[PDB]
Amino acid sequence: MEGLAGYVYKAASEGKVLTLAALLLNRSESDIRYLLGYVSQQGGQRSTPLIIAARNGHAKVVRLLLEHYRVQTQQTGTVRFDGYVIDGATALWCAAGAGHFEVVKLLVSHGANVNHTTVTNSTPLRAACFDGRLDIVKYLVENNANISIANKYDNTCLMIAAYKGHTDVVRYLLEQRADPNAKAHCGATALHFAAEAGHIDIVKELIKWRAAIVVNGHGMTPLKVAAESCKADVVELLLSHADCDRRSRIEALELLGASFANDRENYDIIKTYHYLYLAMLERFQDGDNILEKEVLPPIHAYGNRTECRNPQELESIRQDRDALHMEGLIVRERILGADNIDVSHPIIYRGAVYADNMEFEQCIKLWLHALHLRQKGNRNTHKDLLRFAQVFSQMIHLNETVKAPDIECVLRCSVLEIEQSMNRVKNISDADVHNAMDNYECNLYTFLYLVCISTKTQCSEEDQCKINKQIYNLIHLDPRTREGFTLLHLAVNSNTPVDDFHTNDVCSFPNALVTKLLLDCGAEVNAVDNEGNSALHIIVQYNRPISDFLTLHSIIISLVEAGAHTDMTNKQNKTPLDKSTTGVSEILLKTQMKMSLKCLAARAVRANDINYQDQIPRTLEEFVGFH
Amino acid sequence: MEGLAGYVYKAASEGKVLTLAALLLNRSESDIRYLLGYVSQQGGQRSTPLIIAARNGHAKVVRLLLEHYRVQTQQTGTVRFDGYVIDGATALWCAAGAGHFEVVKLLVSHGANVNHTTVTNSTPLRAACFDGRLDIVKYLVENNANISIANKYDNTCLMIAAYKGHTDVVRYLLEQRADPNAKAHCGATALHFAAEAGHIDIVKELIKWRAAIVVNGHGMTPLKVAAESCKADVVELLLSHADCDRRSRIEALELLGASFANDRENYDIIKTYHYLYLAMLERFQDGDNILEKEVLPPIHAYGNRTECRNPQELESIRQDRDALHMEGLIVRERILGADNIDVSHPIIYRGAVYADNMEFEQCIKLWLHALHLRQKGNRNTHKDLLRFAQVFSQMIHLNETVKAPDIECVLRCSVLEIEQSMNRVKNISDADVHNAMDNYECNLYTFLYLVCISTKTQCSEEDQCKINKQIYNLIHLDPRTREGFTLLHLAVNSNTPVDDFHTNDVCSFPNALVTKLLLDCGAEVNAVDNEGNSALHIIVQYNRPISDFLTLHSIIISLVEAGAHTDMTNKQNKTPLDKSTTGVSEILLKTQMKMSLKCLAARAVRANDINYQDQIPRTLEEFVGFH
Amino acid sequence: LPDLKDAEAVQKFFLEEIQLGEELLAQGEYEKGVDHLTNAIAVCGQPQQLLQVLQQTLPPPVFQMLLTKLPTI
Amino acid sequence: QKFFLEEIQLGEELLAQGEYEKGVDHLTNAIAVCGQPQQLLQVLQQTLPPPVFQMLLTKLPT
């Protein structure tokens, strides 16, 4: 009875309690259990009638389901607050997530479970803290709620509450003798999450109740994270607690000025100069025994400006905007370190400004330094790689040369990150295998864009040879797409996507020179995809033939002169000539076809079935399977 | 034992009289009567327990106390009434204020004075008329009283009966030969106040006893007062008197149409056009010897339109609702005069209406004219000045430029209003000395907000000099707050209140721009409050130094450059270098603290206990007095 | 009025009348809702459990006016 | 002390609660504590109606 069950579920979900009771006239208890087990993939997700009765917020519906009738609260559910489709989501968890005080009160009062565990092992208390209702948390905790249970990331409910601005929830939950020293395996000490969105009152509350400042696993103090997040007031409060430790507050002010220098959210450059002036004055306040900033090498991306040793230098660079940006980045590198994630994000933004003022020479170096840091940290760099493809495309479009070392280095890092992406694809079983595959697709597209850029420049000799070496290494990797294509297939294709930015100016696949470098670099020319097509079979499925006549000539003559059997005869029993779909393509293939005796013989014996299992050589069996 | 009297009242407020009997059981009769003479300062009243128990109306307390020990009921107390406090009050007056026939009828039977005057000289018959209980008024006239009892403003009991709608009180009062034309201090008459409320049965009751219309302190008729507010039904009833000529009925009914155009209670545009048309129809039905309204210039604030010259003009603008609001105000201003109290209030209401519709240009024009008309009348304009600060803050928060000539006009009003408030403070002895001080404080806060608005908004060369000229005039007057802060002290102290409306979003204190603008305008930086704190003293102590350090640095740089002495100690001999909340303020002051041998000499004078008295010139005495 | 249909209106018209009654009492025009409730009660033919169940899914003034509007003895 | 006061306060309170006879008996113990019968009896007549007081008047000497 799928229709009756759908009616019952619709009545429960839409709050139609009267029609639900109408559906409850003398029904069989077996069908009632069938209604209870009607998970029935509504909305593409796991849910029972009681789960949606807690979801929508109709107390009368919940009353009719289990105050008077029988239904269990423990079912496989789905929350999807932030994509969190979590199995085992009970009625209490969803109800506390939705903030229904009456429904939660009834559910606890009749005697349902109040400490339910899900796949992410998150109690309804943590969902209530995520929503931030004082009454729900009050009623749960006084009705025997355990606060010690945390997420699969060991994310304590106090940490989740402090991540938002629920100061009442935070203060009550610490009034329930919860310790703020609950260190997650991520590294959070329940106050970093407070110092994320500038929740100043929550930070004050933790400071009052023995905050016990603890460095995370990233090596950053809460004060350092507060400075990095560009929130000044929490920097004040963290600076005014427990251990002052003058070095710590000095580097905190340095970090705060540096973060204000090159962040998109706060760009008060005068405030950057003033905070750095405070840091310098504190460095030079006591007179004797003044601690001095250590010497760092002048990294060429930030220029040869070796920090700011003396306040005279800071006064000199007071009105120097780009020098201030470089000083901010250098202070970020020195204080925040060159290992964590938070050092990467500002750098690109500064280069982004240089990307908009057409001052490409600093932008390329700065962005390349950001990429090198990302690759050293083994982070996800596909977005930055696509950014470099875009900026090279814009550089070539605006009649500007692209330096060979820059494209060589970005090709090296692209190859290395493609290696890492392949490792993630073949190593991550099911948690993020699809995300890794999409990363692989995007990286392949970006690498081909960069190869197009490399071809379309006034390249040197030996650095272009290094480019060819790197591309040959990536071809020797033999990357494959989700559609089983090779890089040759994408290079000769027109269905390969092109990024919506300035890449459309030069990324005009199929491009002649990209294919030229691809096959002259050495590649598997007969890499038939899992769909059965070849590179020639890709190019005969091309609907814009005349507009690229010279490039199409080049790719056909190149494929014919290097492998690319012109009689591939794919698994769909279609010779590449018969898929030409254009008189030009079939004419060129026929003129480029060659007299092959035991290939017309192969065509003769293909449709006319002749046994080949060990009667012909097994290499000829591979030739037949190729046919 | 005044605490016993308070507990007697507390047991009297709940009506428990045997508890009061037990307390009086073991006590001297003369001693307990002294004890129940008056309660202590409880609830803003040190009144007699018998008075306040009768005010609460618990009659059983009154019976048991009076029958047992016949204490004098004239033992007055500091009784609160109608929010305010009116001492000199007797028990039956407070009983008649709340309304309790059985309390008074026994208290008069016990023995009292039927005409005991309060501090406002309010006899018990006045309170009986205020409540409106006819039985109480029947009992006071049973024992006889006076009807010409003078109030603080010489008010008649008919006037209070005209405030409410106790027609039985009105008819019984005039049945006892009471003149309804008993003029009050402000020309008020029972016809005027009946027209203020709108009881048509009362007005016809007055003329049934031959009441005659008369002018008021503003010189207007009761018909005009009915037209001053929006109570239409009273107008036709007084037009039914037929004593007044047709010229009076034109302006009266036009003002009725004018009043209905712009008022909070009534916004009936439909009847507004009717009344103007009926006024026009009677104006133009004369034919020969036709009369017409006079000419008035189109004040730019009142749009740019005249009132009416042709019937077709207002027949055409009947659909133009916004024009009719303007047409309503123009005829109201023209006839009521510029000196009326209520000629200004609808203009503020119409400006308030345009504020909700984000038509700030028309809102400023109307409010400024309402501000100017109120200023000519020498009224207390601290409220509408705050409204200008409120509406200017909303413009800045919504990213809209403020016409700086309007800033000049409101500042010129704000400057001149301070001069009027200063004279009022030195003139008022005890009548509203606290209210004038509160007006003085709120106006000084209002002036600062407008200055902050001027800094935030764009100002041209002519605008900036005009704004600075007004600040120049005020700072030469040297306003002095209740605690003794100057204008510079007020703009630095973060404890300076900001209005709870949108002024919190724009003008926040301390403000660097306000502090800089004040100093170079010509403010005195060496100002010292009554407590002794200098301008430098207030800024150095500061709660959130890291949070808005740009404001703190700019103020300190601006203040010291003005010429404040960095050693100018307060009455507690605490330096500006001292009283530092955070070491940031110590560093910022010290890095600008230029050292002089004179101030170190001055420091050595007080530190060494040198006898500076009667041994050094007076000019250097004050220099030592700084330290 | 179906007037004792065999099986179709016993289940379909009863559901329609009861749901019209529900939205009528939800919108505040609950007298027509109570009329629909009575019609659906008569149509279904087994109003025993509903006699309690529909008793506990409405405010008490609705119960009072319903028992006045229920002369089904 | 206050126990004599409480029977007086709760005795008249119970009259407001409807227990007039019980309120009389509750307050009766307070009257036996008091040593001034001539002054106290006349005071009780004004608080509550004398027909009710006459019933309370019988409880003291009995």
Side-chain angles (χ1 to χ4, degrees):
Chain A
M1 320 288 109
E2 291 83 3
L4 195 68
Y7 281 153
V8 168
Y9 197 84
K10 183 68 59 193
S13 59
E14 288 300 317
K16 313 307 288 157
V17 55
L18 274 297
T19 81
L20 171 85
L23 293 165
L24 287 175
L25 273 296
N26 209 345
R27 291 298 315 121
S28 53
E29 50 263 9
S30 74
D31 204 75
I32 295 307
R33 262 79 55 92
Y34 160 65
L35 297 172
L36 262 49
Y38 197 59
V39 189
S40 63
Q41 53 103 35
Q42 57 269 7
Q45 59 84 31
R46 298 280 81 83
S47 60
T48 199
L50 204 47
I51 276 164
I52 210 69
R55 166 93 266 168
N56 52 7
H58 292 93
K60 312 287 283 296
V61 169
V62 176
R63 176 172 289 103
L64 269 296
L65 275 296
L66 73 164
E67 181 159 319
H68 289 256
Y69 280 71
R70 63 181 66 251
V71 55
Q72 198 55 255
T73 75
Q74 309 105 53
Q75 284 90 13
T76 292
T78 285
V79 181
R80 74 213 181 279
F81 285 170
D82 204 4
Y84 274 72
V85 179
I86 318 297
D87 308 337
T90 186
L92 272 296
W93 198 29
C94 296
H100 303 318
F101 194 31
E102 297 175 354
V103 178
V104 163
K105 181 175 302 307
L106 180 84
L107 275 158
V108 177
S109 73
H110 79 82
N113 205 338
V114 310
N115 309 319
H116 185 87
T117 313
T118 187
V119 165
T120 49
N121 45 77
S122 160
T123 77
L125 184 62
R126 209 195 51 85
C129 293
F130 191 81
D131 179 60
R133 277 276 277 280
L134 188 153
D135 45 346
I136 299 277
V137 173
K138 182 63 66 68
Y139 197 70
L140 280 179
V141 163
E142 66 93 15
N143 291 139
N144 315 333
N146 188 13
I147 60 186
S148 73
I149 318 290
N151 274 334
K152 69 181 192 299
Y153 289 100
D154 305 335
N155 221 342
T156 310
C157 45
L158 166 68
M159 309 211 265
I160 298 291
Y163 195 66
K164 308 300 183 293
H166 310 133
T167 175
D168 273 316
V169 183
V170 162
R171 77 187 63 202
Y172 170 63
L173 196 152
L174 54 88
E175 267 180 3
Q176 286 317 293
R177 69 156 61 175
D179 59 356
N181 279 325
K183 221 170 161 171
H185 86 94
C186 296
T189 187
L191 188 153
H192 306 153
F193 291 159
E196 283 290 326
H199 307 300
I200 189 67
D201 45 358
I202 300 191
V203 172
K204 196 177 312 190
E205 276 268 356
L206 273 74
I207 285 305
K208 183 210 300 178
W209 281 75
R210 196 42 73 187
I213 184 167
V214 167
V215 186
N216 45 50
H218 271 275
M220 312 184 293
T221 67
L223 182 56
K224 284 179 183 181
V225 184
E228 172 261 340
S229 81
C230 312
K231 308 295 160 52
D233 45 354
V234 297
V235 165
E236 167 193 358
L237 270 195
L238 286 180
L239 194 145
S240 73
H241 94 286
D243 295 331
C244 59
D245 195 69
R246 176 195 310 276
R247 188 273 304 278
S248 70
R249 69 178 291 171
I250 281 173
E251 58 91 8
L253 292 196
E254 273 198 277
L255 196 53
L256 185 46
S259 302
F260 280 167
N262 303 296
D263 208 296
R264 73 200 199 280
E265 296 307 288
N266 314 93
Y267 192 28
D268 280 341
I269 178 62
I270 181 72
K271 200 178 302 181
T272 284
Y273 158 71
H274 275 121
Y275 286 166
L276 208 44
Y277 203 67
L278 261 174
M280 219 61 57
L281 276 188
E282 285 264 3
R283 281 263 168 78
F284 292 84
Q285 179 255 347
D286 186 74
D288 286 340
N289 62 86
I290 51 169
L291 61 84
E292 183 67 30
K293 45 173 61 167
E294 60 265 13
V295 183
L296 267 73
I299 320 167
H300 205 277
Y302 315 124
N304 288 321
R305 302 178 64 251
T306 71
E307 314 184 63
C308 177
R309 316 278 330 267
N310 281 319
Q312 295 316 301
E313 320 177 20
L314 210 51
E315 179 48 58
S316 70
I317 68 159
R318 162 186 210 280
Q319 290 88 357
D320 207 2
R321 308 258 317 280
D322 56 346
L324 275 174
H325 308 140
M326 295 311 113
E327 181 79 36
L329 289 185
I330 288 157
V331 170
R332 285 288 272 190
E333 293 287 334
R334 170 167 43 86
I335 293 312
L336 192 62
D339 68 321
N340 53 3
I341 175 165
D342 291 329
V343 71
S344 173
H345 180 271
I347 299 181
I348 294 95
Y349 174 70
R350 178 49 54 199
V353 180
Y354 294 149
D356 279 31
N357 296 120
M358 301 302 115
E359 197 264 328
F360 285 150
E361 60 269 16
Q362 270 298 321
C363 169
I364 294 313
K365 300 191 288 185
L366 198 62
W367 277 6
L368 193 140
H369 191 242
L371 173 64
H372 178 263
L373 268 295
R374 284 281 271 281
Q375 216 49 60
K376 155 166 196 161
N378 307 327
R379 276 81 63 99
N380 209 338
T381 81
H382 63 297
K383 298 186 293 298
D384 216 8
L385 201 67
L386 181 63
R387 214 163 307 121
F388 299 175
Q390 289 166 208
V391 73
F392 288 165
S393 76
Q394 198 156 9
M395 188 168 325
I396 292 186
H397 186 207
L398 274 78
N399 55 68
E400 180 62 38
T401 180
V402 179
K403 292 301 181 180
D406 311 340
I407 179 70
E408 191 264 342
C409 188
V410 73
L411 275 177
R412 291 216 329 275
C413 287
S414 158
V415 163
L416 188 48
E417 204 266 332
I418 280 175
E419 295 181 358
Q420 199 184 311
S421 180
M422 162 174 265
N423 292 305
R424 286 172 268 175
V425 160
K426 72 173 176 281
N427 279 353
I428 301 306
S429 44
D430 193 75
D432 297 296
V433 59
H434 54 91
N435 290 126
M437 185 173 65
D438 304 341
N439 190 10
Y440 209 59
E441 308 288 317
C442 193
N443 287 321
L444 285 189
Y445 301 147
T446 318
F447 169 76
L448 281 160
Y449 305 151
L450 282 183
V451 171
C452 187
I453 292 299
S454 68
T455 50
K456 284 186 62 47
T457 57
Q458 307 301 315
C459 56
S460 79
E461 193 268 338
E462 76 288 338
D463 215 350
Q464 188 274 151
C465 283
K466 296 288 297 299
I467 277 167
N468 300 319
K469 167 68 175 67
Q470 204 47 256
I471 283 155
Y472 166 65
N473 189 16
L474 200 65
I475 294 310
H476 181 73
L477 186 150
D478 189 46
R480 292 287 189 183
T481 63
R482 174 208 309 162
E483 289 88 3
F485 302 149
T486 179
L487 285 193
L488 268 172
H489 278 185
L490 270 75
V492 69
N493 201 358
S494 68
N495 301 117
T496 297
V498 182
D499 183 75
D500 215 3
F501 280 90
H502 313 80
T503 52
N504 300 109
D505 287 326
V506 287
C507 303
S508 63
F509 287 162
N511 181 278
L513 275 298
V514 177
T515 58
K516 284 301 292 153
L517 188 152
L518 206 46
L519 80 165
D520 296 324
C521 203
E524 190 76 32
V525 71
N526 292 312
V528 168
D529 52 12
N530 44 3
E531 295 96 4
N533 288 324
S534 80
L536 177 55
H537 284 250
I538 287 302
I539 199 57
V540 297
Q541 288 181 355
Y542 181 57
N543 52 342
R544 199 74 192 276
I546 303 171
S547 78
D548 59 315
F549 196 43
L550 185 60
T551 63
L552 191 148
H553 268 174
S554 165
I555 65 185
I556 294 171
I557 195 70
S558 311
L559 283 194
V560 167
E561 276 183 352
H565 194 101
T566 59
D567 194 72
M568 201 273 287
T569 69
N570 52 23
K571 54 183 61 178
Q572 292 85 4
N573 203 7
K574 296 146 184 61
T575 199
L577 184 75
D578 276 341
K579 299 288 95 175
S580 159
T581 73
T582 288
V584 177
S585 51
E586 55 96 20
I587 277 164
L588 286 166
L589 185 52
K590 205 264 160 175
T591 52
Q592 278 318 301
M593 265 167 175
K594 266 79 195 170
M595 185 188 278
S596 43
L597 282 75
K598 64 179 73 175
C599 194
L600 61 83
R603 293 178 101 251
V605 305
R606 181 55 190 240
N608 297 318
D609 200 3
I610 311 288
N611 54 2
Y612 51 88
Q613 314 94 36
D614 303 279
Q615 292 93 23
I616 62 170
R618 66 174 184 261
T619 70
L620 277 296
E621 290 169 11
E622 289 293 324
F623 178 82
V624 161
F626 167 76
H627 269 182
Chain B
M1 311 300 167
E2 301 172 6
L4 275 175
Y7 193 75
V8 161
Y9 154 65
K10 186 175 179 180
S13 57
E14 44 176 0
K16 313 305 178 284
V17 310
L18 282 181
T19 68
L20 304 187
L23 266 69
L24 265 72
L25 187 61
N26 319 320
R27 189 66 262 175
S28 164
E29 45 264 18
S30 68
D31 181 82
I32 198 55
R33 277 176 65 189
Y34 164 70
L35 286 196
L36 60 87
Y38 54 93
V39 310
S40 181
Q41 281 82 245
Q42 167 260 331
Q45 55 88 31
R46 51 173 185 88
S47 311
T48 300
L50 189 63
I51 296 173
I52 187 57
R55 193 185 167 222
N56 274 109
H58 294 56
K60 197 66 65 67
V61 183
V62 177
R63 305 159 199 277
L64 270 296
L65 188 152
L66 277 183
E67 284 168 299
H68 205 191
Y69 284 143
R70 308 165 158 78
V71 73
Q72 184 53 260
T73 62
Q74 314 305 123
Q75 300 323 106
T76 182
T78 313
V79 180
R80 62 166 304 278
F81 193 68
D82 296 357
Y84 295 99
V85 167
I86 296 95
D87 55 353
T90 184
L92 73 164
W93 178 83
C94 309
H100 293 91
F101 175 61
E102 79 291 334
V103 170
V104 190
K105 85 180 174 61
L106 202 57
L107 192 145
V108 174
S109 308
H110 189 99
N113 189 12
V114 289
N115 295 111
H116 197 205
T117 63
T118 63
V119 67
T120 66
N121 312 289
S122 171
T123 53
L125 195 142
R126 178 176 182 94
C129 293
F130 173 62
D131 202 30
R133 307 209 49 86
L134 193 56
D135 47 357
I136 309 189
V137 188
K138 276 201 298 295
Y139 198 89
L140 276 296
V141 305
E142 171 71 29
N143 295 103
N144 309 286
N146 195 7
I147 49 176
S148 87
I149 289 302
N151 208 54
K152 284 273 220 297
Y153 312 124
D154 190 28
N155 304 147
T156 300
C157 292
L158 294 152
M159 315 297 159
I160 312 168
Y163 284 165
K164 307 312 170 316
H166 313 291
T167 69
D168 46 346
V169 167
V170 176
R171 69 174 65 103
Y172 197 46
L173 206 48
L174 61 85
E175 266 158 355
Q176 301 303 317
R177 275 166 282 101
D179 185 74
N181 306 310
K183 188 146 295 310
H185 84 301
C186 61
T189 305
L191 297 100
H192 285 265
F193 280 154
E196 174 82 23
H199 319 291
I200 50 170
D201 43 0
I202 281 185
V203 186
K204 71 174 58 66
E205 184 76 29
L206 264 67
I207 200 174
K208 186 264 288 181
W209 214 244
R210 293 301 104 174
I213 55 169
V214 75
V215 311
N216 68 327
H218 277 247
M220 68 184 71
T221 61
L223 187 56
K224 284 162 189 275
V225 176
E228 190 178 6
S229 291
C230 53
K231 299 294 302 178
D233 48 354
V234 194
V235 179
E236 295 92 6
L237 193 139
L238 191 152
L239 295 181
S240 297
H241 297 181
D243 52 339
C244 47
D245 55 351
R246 62 192 300 254
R247 214 177 40 185
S248 50
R249 82 178 68 249
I250 286 157
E251 56 86 19
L253 195 150
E254 213 164 5
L255 261 57
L256 191 63
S259 300
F260 272 108
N262 291 315
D263 213 330
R264 175 185 303 281
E265 312 298 322
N266 298 65
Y267 184 67
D268 196 353
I269 313 169
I270 296 90
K271 287 299 121 174
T272 291
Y273 164 61
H274 289 88
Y275 300 149
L276 272 295
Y277 170 67
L278 265 67
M280 179 53 72
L281 191 141
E282 203 279 334
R283 193 90 57 84
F284 267 57
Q285 64 100 26
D286 209 344
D288 44 345
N289 312 113
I290 171 171
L291 73 165
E292 80 272 13
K293 49 183 74 173
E294 270 172 2
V295 62
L296 186 77
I299 295 98
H300 171 48
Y302 281 155
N304 218 4
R305 277 83 55 194
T306 186
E307 303 86 4
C308 294
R309 268 88 56 83
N310 300 320
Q312 299 89 11
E313 300 164 354
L314 72 164
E315 273 155 52
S316 75
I317 67 181
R318 58 174 291 276
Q319 200 54 46
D320 300 339
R321 44 169 190 174
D322 47 331
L324 294 175
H325 310 140
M326 298 303 175
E327 297 299 328
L329 285 177
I330 296 160
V331 300
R332 187 157 183 170
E333 163 62 39
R334 172 191 42 119
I335 300 299
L336 271 182
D339 50 352
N340 197 12
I341 289 171
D342 189 74
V343 76
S344 58
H345 155 81
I347 317 169
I348 321 173
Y349 176 74
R350 165 62 40 193
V353 165
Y354 279 168
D356 303 327
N357 305 327
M358 308 299 184
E359 196 170 4
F360 293 100
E361 207 273 334
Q362 298 291 112
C363 171
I364 286 304
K365 286 153 63 174
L366 293 153
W367 273 1
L368 271 172
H369 204 249
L371 183 75
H372 277 294
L373 295 156
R374 206 183 270 258
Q375 277 288 117
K376 191 263 290 180
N378 215 37
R379 322 288 191 80
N380 193 7
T381 77
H382 85 284
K383 203 51 177 274
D384 44 354
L385 274 176
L386 190 81
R387 285 194 192 86
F388 267 111
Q390 284 160 266
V391 71
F392 282 153
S393 281
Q394 206 176 239
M395 286 185 226
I396 298 304
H397 175 47
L398 271 72
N399 318 123
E400 201 265 334
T401 187
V402 177
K403 278 204 310 300
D406 307 331
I407 282 283
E408 187 266 311
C409 200
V410 71
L411 278 184
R412 181 211 297 118
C413 173
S414 162
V415 160
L416 195 147
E417 192 271 343
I418 289 296
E419 313 216 342
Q420 204 254 332
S421 66
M422 283 273 293
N423 302 344
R424 270 181 307 180
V425 159
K426 85 167 59 64
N427 284 337
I428 287 302
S429 64
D430 193 75
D432 277 323
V433 59
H434 204 106
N435 204 61
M437 279 188 282
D438 291 341
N439 282 276
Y440 199 61
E441 296 303 276
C442 195
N443 286 293
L444 268 182
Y445 304 148
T446 302
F447 179 80
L448 277 185
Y449 310 145
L450 299 159
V451 162
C452 201
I453 289 296
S454 66
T455 56
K456 291 294 289 184
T457 197
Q458 185 46 255
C459 296
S460 72
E461 50 268 18
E462 187 255 341
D463 305 331
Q464 195 48 252
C465 80
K466 282 267 196 54
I467 291 158
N468 286 318
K469 183 94 183 53
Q470 304 285 350
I471 303 171
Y472 200 47
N473 288 123
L474 186 47
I475 203 64
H476 271 290
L477 192 139
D478 198 0
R480 194 63 61 190
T481 62
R482 193 182 301 112
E483 62 265 50
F485 294 162
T486 184
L487 201 52
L488 183 62
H489 289 186
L490 203 59
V492 175
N493 202 358
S494 73
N495 285 330
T496 303
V498 185
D499 193 27
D500 67 324
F501 211 63
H502 288 114
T503 71
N504 284 332
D505 303 336
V506 174
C507 55
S508 63
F509 292 154
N511 190 279
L513 309 171
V514 180
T515 317
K516 181 69 176 177
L517 196 64
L518 266 166
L519 285 175
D520 48 46
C521 177
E524 40 182 1
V525 66
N526 306 321
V528 169
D529 62 345
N530 299 353
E531 206 270 345
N533 290 321
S534 56
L536 211 47
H537 282 171
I538 313 171
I539 185 56
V540 175
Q541 48 97 215
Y542 182 75
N543 48 3
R544 296 170 333 268
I546 311 290
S547 176
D548 52 355
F549 168 73
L550 169 65
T551 48
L552 169 62
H553 171 96
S554 299
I555 286 162
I556 284 294
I557 286 307
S558 183
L559 276 181
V560 180
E561 199 65 35
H565 204 86
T566 79
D567 298 341
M568 187 196 300
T569 66
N570 70 317
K571 206 56 70 189
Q572 272 55 59
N573 303 266
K574 285 191 319 287
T575 80
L577 182 53
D578 210 358
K579 210 189 174 183
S580 68
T581 303
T582 310
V584 168
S585 62
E586 279 179 352
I587 288 172
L588 270 297
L589 193 43
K590 278 161 73 174
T591 194
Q592 199 58 75
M593 185 153 143
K594 177 60 190 70
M595 188 42 74
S596 77
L597 293 97
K598 302 289 194 289
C599 69
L600 285 174
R603 176 70 54 192
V605 163
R606 280 185 180 264
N608 301 320
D609 206 13
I610 307 291
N611 196 356
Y612 43 75
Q613 183 49 244
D614 208 26
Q615 288 183 359
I616 195 68
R618 180 199 301 276
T619 56
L620 193 60
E621 285 270 350
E622 190 51 57
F623 194 85
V624 171
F626 279 144
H627 300 67
Chain C
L1 195 74
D3 210 358
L4 190 151
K5 292 295 182 183
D6 60 357
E8 171 63 38
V10 189
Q11 56 90 30
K12 211 265 172 189
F13 180 80
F14 150 75
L15 273 163
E16 298 326 289
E17 207 80 4
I18 204 75
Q19 69 95 19
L20 269 75
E22 180 186 355
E23 289 105 15
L24 279 166
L25 65 93
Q27 281 317 292
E29 298 94 7
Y30 58 92
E31 56 271 15
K32 206 180 178 179
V34 163
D35 301 321
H36 285 70
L37 288 165
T38 305
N39 198 7
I41 277 168
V43 162
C44 80
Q46 61 183 357
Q48 310 100 15
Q49 318 196 110
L50 289 189
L51 173 63
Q52 205 59 259
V53 163
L54 305 189
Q55 196 170 354
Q56 46 87 48
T57 301
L58 51 82
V62 169
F63 168 61
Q64 295 140 30
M65 60 95 59
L66 170 70
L67 69 93
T68 61
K69 283 182 72 184
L70 265 185
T72 69
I73 294 94
Chain D
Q1 53 92 30
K2 187 62 70 72
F3 80 104
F4 154 71
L5 293 173
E6 267 316 299
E7 309 299 311
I8 278 176
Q9 175 184 1
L10 299 175
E12 51 94 19
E13 183 80 36
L14 285 163
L15 315 178
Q17 305 310 120
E19 287 181 352
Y20 266 89
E21 168 65 39
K22 205 262 168 188
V24 160
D25 188 54
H26 186 92
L27 191 144
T28 304
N29 287 316
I31 322 169
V33 172
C34 169
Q36 304 94 17
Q38 52 267 10
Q39 285 91 16
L40 190 69
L41 290 183
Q42 306 272 9
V43 173
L44 263 293
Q45 197 171 4
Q46 299 108 25
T47 286
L48 58 87
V52 189
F53 154 77
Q54 199 172 11
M55 154 182 75
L56 188 145
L57 194 50
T58 317
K59 262 77 174 177
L60 168 64
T62 48

